[PDB]
């Protein structure tokens with residue numbers, strides 16, 4: 059199948075919106091990580107490919123995905139970065155886990171529909 063960018067945006071954006079909507083848990087994930095501002099200067103050493111909700115939104119808005127699994131992969135890159143960088147006690151780690159719970163419910167029917 060050839061997926062048009064407007065079709066991917068229309069189908070997938072609600073699943074991203076579900077993550078944005080989560081408070082407090084989306085807060086760490088709404089903007090790209092700025093290691094200087096956050097006082098975590100080793101972040102890019104450990105996290106080779108940073109990813110966040112706003113970057114994913116921008117990719118949908120600008121037609122950067124050819125396939126819907128590329129979108130799923132970026133969401134999971136964001137999750138895996140957070141579980142990699144943070145210890146299990148951190149808010150960021152626990153908030154990530156909550157987003158993954160929400161996402162799994164949202165994404166399932168949408169991916170089935172897209173095929």
Ligand SMILES: C[C@@H]1CC(=O)Nc2cccc(-c3ccc4c(c3)c(C3CC3)nn4C)c2N1
Nearest residue numbers: 085086087091096098139140143144149150
């Ligand atoms: C995802 C990003 C990078 C990472 O993996 N660890 C990390 C460490 C310190 C603060 C943060 C961090 C970044 C932005 C935040 C926050 C934490 C938070 C606090 C509510 C949890 N609010 N916002 C706007 C952080 N999160």
Ligand SMILES: [Ca+2]
Nearest residue numbers: 080081082083
């Ligand atoms: Ca809530």
